[PDB]
Amino acid sequence: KGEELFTGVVPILVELDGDVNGHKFSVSGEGEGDATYGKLTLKFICTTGKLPVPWPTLVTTLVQCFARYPDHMKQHDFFKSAMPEGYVQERTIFFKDDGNYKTRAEVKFEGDTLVNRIELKGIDFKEDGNILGHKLEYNYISDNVYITADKQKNGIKANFKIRHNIEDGGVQLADHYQQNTPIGDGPVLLPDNHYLSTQSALSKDPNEKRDHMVLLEFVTAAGIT
Numbered sequence: 001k002g003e004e005l006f007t008g009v010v011p012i013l014v015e016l017d018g019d020v021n022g023h024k025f026s027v028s029g030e031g032e033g034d035a036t037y038g039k040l041t042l043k044f045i046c047t048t049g050k051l052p053v054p055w056p057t058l059v060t061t062l063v064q065c066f067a068r069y070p071d072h073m074k075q076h077d078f079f080k081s082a083m084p085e086g087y088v089q090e091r092t093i094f095f096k097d098d099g100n101y102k103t104r105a106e107v108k109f110e111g112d113t114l115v116n117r118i119e120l121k122g123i124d125f126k127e128d129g130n131i132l133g134h135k136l137e138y139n140y141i142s143d144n145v146y147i148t149a150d151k152q153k154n155g156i157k158a159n160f161k162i163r164h165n166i167e168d169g170g171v172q173l174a175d176h177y178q179q180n181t182p183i184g185d186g187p188v189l190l191p192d193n194h195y196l197s198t199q200s201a202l203s204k205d206p207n208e209k210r211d212h213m214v215l216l217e218f219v220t221a222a223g224i225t
Contacts, residue, residue: 001082003074005037005064006088011113012042014062018026019136020122021099021132029062031215033114035080038068040217045165045210053122055213056164060176060201061091063116064145067196067219069198078147078156078180084109085184087155096173099125108183130164130172137165138202144222145178145196153186155181194223 009223014029031042044055044062051058065079079087093101105118123130147158158178163171182188200217 002080003077004126005034005083005109006080006159008036009034010066012040012063012066012116013110013113014042014044014118015114016058016062016118016120017121018053018058018122020053020101020120020126021127024048025052027051027062028057029116033063033066035066035068038066038219040066040215040219042175042215042217043205044215045208046212049211051211053131054134054138054164056136056138056141056202057095057101057131058120059104059141059173059202059213060093060162060174061101061118061120062215063107064089064196065107065114065116067221069221073194073221073224075189076194076221078189078191079107081187081189082180082182082184085182085186087180087182089178089180091176091178093177095125095129095131097103098129098131098172099123102181106183131164135167136172137167139165140199140201142199145198146174146193147191147195148193149190150181151178151190153179153181154190156191165175192224196220196222197222 016027025048029044069077089105091103162174203214
């Protein structure tokens with residue numbers, strides 16, 4: 001039933017409140033998702049002024065229900081199966097040699113709109129590190145989200161690494177640990193091990209003077225043949 005909700009283009013709203021080493025901020029996002037093509041188009045605005053962390057560090061936090069699942073893998077799509085009631089998505093994101101983000105989000109439909117409401121808390125960051133020092137490149141993120149079932153919670157877990165390019169030429173690793181649990185009480189699809197191949201392209205609206213990020217993203221399930 002949940003998959004029926006994703007056969008066309010679905011409006012998306014994202015709302016985030018964050019606090020990182022005491023710097024509080026909010027982000028609002030709007031866009032569209034077309035799961036038939038695994039395609040997301042979004043624009044995010046920092047509504048509190050200047051973002052105190054790099055935009056690239058927030059991409060993964062800021063709707064995997066829009067993944068394209070190949071027909072032969074459709075029985076492994078936890079994310080859509082939880083809809084419309086939704087799921088809670090929690091992460092800890094460990095920035096190597098630096099601080100960590102802990103995030104909790106509720107992803108669900110509000111009418112015809114897919115909504116991602118998030119709280120993020122960041123701690124133990126270095127004032128002169130790659131994050132608070134704004135040393136990360138703004139271009140592209142691409143990696144694989146490794147997914148496994150979590151039968152005890154009627155959900156899933158996932159793990160992955162993001163290699164954020166640093167302006168000096170190096171890498172800032174961000175190790176992601178993820179858990180998703182359904183909000184509703186109904187059956188969900190508990191998947192075999194697989195992954196989501198995800199590519200996010202970051203850009204700017206030349207006419208936008210607010211601190212913002214434009215994102216074109218593709219997400220495709222893979223790893224079962």
